[PDB]
Amino acid sequence: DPCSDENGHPRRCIPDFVNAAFGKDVRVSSTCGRPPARYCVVSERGEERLRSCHLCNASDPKKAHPPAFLTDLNNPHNLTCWQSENYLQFPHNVTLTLSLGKKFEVTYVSLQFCSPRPESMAIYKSMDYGRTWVPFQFYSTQCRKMYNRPHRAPITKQNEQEAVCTDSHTDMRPLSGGLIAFSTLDGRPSAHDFDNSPVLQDWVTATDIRVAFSRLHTFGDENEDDSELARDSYFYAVSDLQVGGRCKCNGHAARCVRDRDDSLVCDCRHNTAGPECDRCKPFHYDRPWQRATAREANECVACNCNLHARRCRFNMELYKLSGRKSGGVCLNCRHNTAGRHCHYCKEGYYRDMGKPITHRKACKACDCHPVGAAGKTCNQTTGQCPCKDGVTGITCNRCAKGYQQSRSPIAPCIKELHHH
Amino acid sequence: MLPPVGVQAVALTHDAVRVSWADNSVPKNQKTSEVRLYTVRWRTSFSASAKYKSEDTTSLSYTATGLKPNTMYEFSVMVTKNRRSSTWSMTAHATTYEAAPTSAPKDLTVITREGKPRAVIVSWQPPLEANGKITAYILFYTLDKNIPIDDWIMETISGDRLTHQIMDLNLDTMYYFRIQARNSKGVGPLSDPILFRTLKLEVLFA
Amino acid sequence: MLPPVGVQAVALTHDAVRVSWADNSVPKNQKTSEVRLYTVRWRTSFSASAKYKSEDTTSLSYTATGLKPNTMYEFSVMVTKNRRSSTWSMTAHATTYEAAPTSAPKDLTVITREGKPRAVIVSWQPPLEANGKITAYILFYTLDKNIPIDDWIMETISGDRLTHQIMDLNLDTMYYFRIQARNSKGVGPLSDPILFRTLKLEVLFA
Numbered sequence: 154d155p156c157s158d159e160n161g162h163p164r165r166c167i168p169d170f171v172n173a174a175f176g177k178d179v180r181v182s183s184t185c186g187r188p189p190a191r192y193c194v195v196s197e198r199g200e201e202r203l204r205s206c207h208l209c210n211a212s213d214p215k216k217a218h219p220p221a222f223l224t225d226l227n228n229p230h231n232l233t234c235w236q237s238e239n240y241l242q243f244p245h246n247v248t249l250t251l252s253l254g255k256k257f258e259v260t261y262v263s264l265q266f267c268s269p270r271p272e273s274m275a276i277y278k279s280m281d282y283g284r285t286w287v288p289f290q291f292y293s294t295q296c297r298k299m300y301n302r303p304h305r306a307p308i309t310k311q312n313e314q315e316a317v318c319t320d321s322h323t324d325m326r327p328l329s330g331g332l333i334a335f336s337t338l339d340g341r342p343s344a345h346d347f348d349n350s351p352v353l354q355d356w357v358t359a360t361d362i363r364v365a366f367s368r369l370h371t372f373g374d375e376n377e378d379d380s381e382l383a384r385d386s387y388f389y390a391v392s393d394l395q396v397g398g399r400c401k402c403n404g405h406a407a408r409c410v411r412d413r414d415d416s417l418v419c420d421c422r423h424n425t426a427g428p429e430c431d432r433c434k435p436f437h438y439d440r441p442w443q444r445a446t447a448r449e450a451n452e453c454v455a456c457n458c459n460l461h462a463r464r465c466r467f468n469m470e471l472y473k474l475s476g477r478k479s480g481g482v483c484l485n486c487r488h489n490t491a492g493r494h495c496h497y498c499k500e501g502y503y504r505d506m507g508k509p510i511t512h513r514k515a516c517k518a519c520d521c522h523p524v525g526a527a528g529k530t531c532n533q534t535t536g537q538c539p540c541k542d543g544v545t546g547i548t549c550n551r552c553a554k555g556y557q558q559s560r561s562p563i564a565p566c567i568k569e570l571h572h573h
Numbered sequence: 574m575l576p577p578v579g580v581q582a583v584a585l586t587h588d589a590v591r592v593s594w595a596d597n598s599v600p601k602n603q604k605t606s607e608v609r610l611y612t613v614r615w616r617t618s619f620s621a622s623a624k625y626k627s628e629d630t631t632s633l634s635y636t637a638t639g640l641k642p643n644t645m646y647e648f649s650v651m652v653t654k655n656r657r658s659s660t661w662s663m664t665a666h667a668t669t670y671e672a673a674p675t676s677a678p679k680d681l682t683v684i685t686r687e688g689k690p691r692a693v694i695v696s697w698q699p700p701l702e703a704n705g706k707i708t709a710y711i712l713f714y715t716l717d718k719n720i721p722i723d724d725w726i727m728e729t730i731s732g733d734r735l736t737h738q739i740m741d742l743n744l745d746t747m748y749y750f751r752i753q754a755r756n757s758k759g760v761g762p763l764s765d766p767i768l769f770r771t772l773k774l775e776v777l778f779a
Numbered sequence: 780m781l782p783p784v785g786v787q788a789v790a791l792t793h794d795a796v797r798v799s800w801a802d803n804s805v806p807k808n809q810k811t812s813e814v815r816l817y818t819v820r821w822r823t824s825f826s827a828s829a830k831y832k833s834e835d836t837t838s839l840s841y842t843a844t845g846l847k848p849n850t851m852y853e854f855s856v857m858v859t860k861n862r863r864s865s866t867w868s869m870t871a872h873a874t875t876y877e878a879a880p881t882s883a884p885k886d887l888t889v890i891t892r893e894g895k896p897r898a899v900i901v902s903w904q905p906p907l908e909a910n911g912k913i914t915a916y917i918l919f920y921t922l923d924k925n926i927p928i929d930d931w932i933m934e935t936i937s938g939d940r941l942t943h944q945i946m947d948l949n950l951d952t953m954y955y956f957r958i959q960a961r962n963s964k965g966v967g968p969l970s971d972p973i974l975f976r977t978l979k980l981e982v983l984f985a
C-alpha cells in the first residue's frame with residue numbers, strides 16, 4: 154500500500170486522478186427533442202456565412218442530444234454532442250449541474266463545444282452537497298456589467314479564495330470545437346505551497362458543480378431579425394464535460410469506495426475517520442488530527458492507557474504540558490488504576506511489582522483493617538498500611554508485642570498487657 | 574438572552590458525536606472581548622446518575638469524543654456573551670454506533686438433560702460489554718484441552734437465545750465449554766473454559 | 780458493617796482455647812430473623828499452609844477444641860446480620876498448654892570414643908511429638924535384655940543436650956540402649972532398643 158513505505162512508517166497517500174464527470178447523470182434545464190424543433194449549423198469553409206439545418210426529436214436515437222452526451226466516451230472522430238433548444242438568450246440562462254456525491258479536490262473543469270462558445274458563462278461549485286452554491290469562475294467580455302466582477306482582477310493572498318472573471322475563451326471565432334478550460338490553481342500565490350495552504354485546499358474542494366450559460370453570440374447584430382431560420386442557429390452545445398480531480402481524503406487514504414449505504418467514502422488509513430479522513434478514529438486522540446503533507450504523514454496515534462481503558466479523549470492543556478507529545482486522557486480507568494494514562498494504582502491499592510503495569514492484576518488491594526489501620530492508602534512498594542499506635546501487621550490486623558485489642562473502635566490494641 | 578437553537582446530534586463513530594447549532598443573535602461583528610462563547614453539555618440519555626460533561630467552543634459545532642459504543646446521549650447548548658449567559662438550549666439526542674463486544678458471556682452453566690443422558694442444556698447470560706445487539710452466540714466444546722482453540726466443535730446459536738442443547742455426548746467423559754458473543758460489528762472474546770463431566774452408565778440406575 | 784472488636788484468646792488446656800469478643804452494634808433487640816451470628820476463624824499462627832477452621836456461634840465467646848499441644852494459633856472473628864456480613868476482626872493469638880511427649884527421640888546412635896575404649900558417645904535427636912519444651916533426656920543401657928525395663932542404668936541428660944558420654948563399658952560385650960524424652964508436663968515413651976557391641980581387646984591394635 155502507498156500509505157506506508159517498506160519499513161513501513163506511514164506516508165501521505167492520495168487516491169488516483171480521475172474524470173469525476175465521466176459516466177454520471179447530469180441534470181440540465183434545456184434539451185432538444187420535446188417538441189422536435191429545427192436547429193441550424195452555421196459554418197464557413199471559404200468566406201462569409203453558410204447554413205445547414207436539421208431536425209432534433211428525442212424519440213429517435215439518431216437525431217437526439219440527451220444530457221448523457223456530456224459525460225460519455227468522447228471519441229474526437231465522432232463527437233457525441235449535447236445541445237439545447239433554442240434561443241435562450243437573456244436573462245434566460247441554461248444550467249448544467251452534476252452531483253459528485255463526495256468532496257473532491259477539483260484540479261480543472263473543461264468543456265468542449267459543438268456550437269460556438271457563449272459570450273458569458275459561469276461556473277458554480279458547492280461544498281455542502283447542493284444546498285448552497287458559490288462562484289468558481291466567470292467568463293464574459295463585460296464582467297463588471299454581467300456578473301458584477303472586476304475584469305480580470307488580480308489575485309493576491311487576500312482575494313485568493315475569490316472567483317475571478319476573464320474575457321478569454323469567450324470569442325466565437327472557433328465556432329466549432331471551442332474549448333473552455335478552468336484551472337483552479339491558475340495564478341494563485343499559494344499554489345506552489347499547496348500542502349501548507351488551507352485557503353487553497355478549501356478552494357479546490359467541491360461537492361457539486363454547476364455550469365451556467367448566460368448570454369449567447371451573434372454575427373455583428375444579425376439576429377434581432379426573428380427569422381425561423383436565423384434564431385434556429387443560435388444555441389448552446391457541448392461535446393464533452395470533464396471535472397479533473399481526486400477524492401478529498403487529506404492524504405490519509407489511497408482510494409475511495411462505496412460502503413453499505415452506497416455512498417462514496419474514502420477508505421481511511423493512518424488511524425483516521427470520517428468521510429474525508431477528517432477525524433481520528435476512536436482511542437487515537439493522543440495528538441490533534443491534521444492533514445497529511447508530503448513531509449509528514451501526521452497519522453493519528455493511539456491513546457496510551459496501559460491496557461486499562463477503551464475510551465479516551467484529547468486534552469489541550471495536558472498536551473502542552475507534555476511538550477506537545479501526548480494529550481490523550483484515558484476515561485474510566487478500570488483494573489483499579491489511576492492517572493491520565495492508567496500508569497499507577499489508585500488510592501487503597503498497591504502495585505504488585507511481579508506484574509508489568511499493563512497486566513490485568515497489576516494492582517493489588519491494600520485491605521487495610523477498618524479498625525487497625527489509620528487509613529486506606531498504603532505503601533506502593535511494600536503495601537504496609539498506616540498502622541495506628543499499638544497496631545502491627547501488613548494490613549494492621551493484629552496487636553504489637555505487649556498489647557491487647559480493646560472494645561474501643563478508635564482505640565484498638567492500645568490496652569497494654571498489664572500483669573494480671 | 575436567547576439560547577442557541579437548531580441543535581443537531583449526529584452519530585459519527587462508536588465514540589464520537591457531532592453537535593451543531595445556530596445563533597440568531599447576530600450583531601455587527603467581529604469584536605472583541607465579548608465574542609459569543611458556546612458551551613456543549615452532554616450526558617447519558619435517560620439514565621440514573623449522569624453528572625453531565627461540558628466543554629467550551631467558539632464555533633457552531635462541537636464533537637463529543639470517548640463516548641460509550643451503542644449509547645444514547647443528551648446534548649444541550651448555552652451561549653455566553655460576557656458577562657451575560659443564556660439558559661440551556663433544547664436537548665438533541667444521538668446514539669453512538671455499535672462495536673464488537675469486549676467481553677464474554679457470563680453465567681455459563683452446563684446442566685444434564687432429564688432424564689436423557691448423552692445430552693446437556695447449556696445456559697448463559699449476555700455479556701456486560703456487548704457494545705451492540707447480539708446477533709449470534711458461538712459455542713465451543715470438546716473432550717481434550719490440549720488441542721488448539723479453533724478445532725473444537727463450533728455451533729452457532731441464534732443470538733436471541735440463551736439456551737442450547739448439545740447431544741450425543743459420551744458417558745463418563747470430561748467435556749470442556751467455551752462461548753463468545755457476536756454482533757453487527759464483529760465478535761467478542763471467548764470465556765474461560767468450564768469443565769463438565771458426564772455421568773457413568775451405572776449411576777443412571779436409579 | 781463494623782467487625783467485632785476486643786477479641787481475646789485464652790489458653791485453657793493443651794487443646795482448648797477460649798476466644799471472646801464484643802459487638803458495639805447494639806440496636807433495639809431481640810428480633811428475629813436477623814440475629815447477629817458470629818463466626819470464629821482459626822489456624823496455626825505464622826505457618827506454611829493453615830487453611831483455617833471456622834465455626835458459627837451466636838454467643839460472644841467460642842472455645843476452639845482439639846488443638847495441638849504447645850502451639851500458637853491465630854483467631855479472627857466476623858459478624859453476619861443477614862444478609863449483611865462484616866470483614867474479619869483483628870486477630871488474637873494464643874498458645875495451647877504443653878503436654879507429656881507422645882513419641883521417643885529419633886536418630887539414636889552409639890559411637891565409640893576415640894581413641895579411648897570402654898567409652899562411647901551417644902547422640903540423638905529431639906522427638907517430633909515433644910508437645911512442650913524438653914527438660915530432660917532419660918537414658919537407659921545394660922548388658923542383658925532379659926531383665927525388666929526399669930532396672931537398667933538410668934542416667935538423666937540435661938535436656939538441652941543431644942550428646943552423652945557413657946564410660947567404663949566392658950570390652951567384647953553387647954550393650955543395649957533406650958532413651959525417652961521428658962518435659963514440664965511429664966515424660967514420653969521409650970524408644971526401641973538399639974544394640975551396640977564394644978570392640979575386642981586384640982582389635983584395638985592397631
Ligand SMILES: *[C@@H]1O[C@H](CO)[C@@H](O[C@@H]2O[C@H](CO)[C@@H](O)[C@H](O)[C@H]2NC(C)=O)[C@H](O)[C@H]1NC(C)=O
Binds near residue numbers: 189210211213
Ligand atoms: C419523433 O418520433 C419519431 C422518431 O422516430 C417520429 O415518428 C416515428 O417514426 C415513424 C416516422 O418516421 C412513424 O411512422 C412512427 O409511428 C413513429 N414511431 C414512434 C415510436 O414515435 C416522429 O415523427 C418524430 N417527430 C417529428 C416531429 O418528426
Ligand SMILES: *[C@@H]1O[C@H](CO)[C@@H](O[C@@H]2O[C@H](CO)[C@@H](O)[C@H](O)[C@H]2NC(C)=O)[C@H](O)[C@H]1NC(C)=O
Binds near residue numbers: 244245365
Ligand atoms: C439563471 O436563471 C434561472 C432561471 O430563472 C435562475 O433560477 C432562478 O433563481 C432565482 C434566484 O433566487 C429564484 O428566485 C427563481 O425561483 C429561480 N427560477 C426557478 C424557475 O426556480 C437562476 O438563479 C439564474 N442563474 C443565476 C442568476 O446565476
Ligand SMILES: [Ca+2]
Binds near residue numbers: 222227
Ligand atoms: Ca460526448
Ligand SMILES: [Cl-]
Binds near residue numbers: 434435586
Ligand atoms: Cl472516533
